[PDB]
Amino acid sequence: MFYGTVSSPDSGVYEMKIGSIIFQVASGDITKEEADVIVNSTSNSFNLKAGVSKAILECAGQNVERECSQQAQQRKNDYIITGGGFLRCKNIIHVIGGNDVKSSVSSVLQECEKKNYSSICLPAIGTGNAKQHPDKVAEAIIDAIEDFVQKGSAQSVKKVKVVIFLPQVLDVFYANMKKREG
Numbered sequence: 001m002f003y004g005t006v007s008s009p010d011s012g013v014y015e016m017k018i019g020s021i022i023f024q025v026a027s028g029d030i031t032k033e034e035a036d037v038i039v040n041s042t043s044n045s046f047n048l049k050a051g052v053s054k055a056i057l058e059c060a061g062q063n064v065e066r067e068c069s070q071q072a073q074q075r076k077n078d079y080i081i082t083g084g085g086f087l088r089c090k091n092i093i094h095v096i097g098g099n100d101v102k103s104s105v106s107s108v109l110q111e112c113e114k115k116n117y118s119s120i121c122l123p124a125i126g127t128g129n130a131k132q133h134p135d136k137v138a139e140a141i142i143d144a145i146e147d148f149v150q151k152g153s154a155q156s157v158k159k160v161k162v163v164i165f166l167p168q169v170l171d172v173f174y175a176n177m178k179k180r181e182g
């Protein structure tokens with residue numbers, strides 16, 4: 001009851017409506033994206049520096065690294081919200097790559113509504129160091145957005161973009177979108 005048609009605005013880039021949200025996928029470097037929130041896929045200690053998290057932490061800067069460790073030594077966090085540092089965003093949300101991906105995405109969406117944010121950019125959460133399977137990750141990300149729309153929760157959020165390091169993972173996301181199209 002929610003999905004539009006899959007189309008391609010540029011070479012290797014794909015989009016479809018899910019209710020009121022435009023869902024987009026593309027392969028590339030997530031550290032040169034602009035969005036209200038950029039998501040980092042990290043460890044349960046919020047200090048992973050390998051793969052996409054290496055790139056995010058080095059570009060964001062030592063003040064963001066400091067924010068992560070400061071917050072990690074206060075309570076048991078499922079995820080952590082920091083400033084964007086020298087990334088082009090208002091906040092970074094650091095999620096645990098090994099956690100349930102649907103749950104992690106649902107939390108990001110809810111935190112973005114709380115701040116009246118309109119745009120989100122995320123990696124293929126959990127497919128790096130955590131070694132979750134790409135089609136299970138794609139299914140979980142898109143399911144989280146469907147549930148958020150079904151509940152009438154999308155108000156400020158208008159665009160959700162997955163920027164994916166490996167082209168082979170981009171191909172898996174495309175196939176999952178085609179399976180759902182209306």
Ligand SMILES: O=C(NCCc1ccncc1)NC1CCCCC1
Nearest residue numbers: 050051052053054055128129130165
């Ligand atoms: O894939 C890589 N490095 C490739 C370079 C790269 C990766 C991501 N973002 C920018 C540059 N390392 C992997 C990460 C997962 C754990 C085992 C090492």
Ligand SMILES: [Cl-]
Nearest residue numbers: 123124164165
């Ligand atoms: Cl990725």
Ligand SMILES: [Cl-]
Nearest residue numbers: 097126128129
């Ligand atoms: Cl990961």
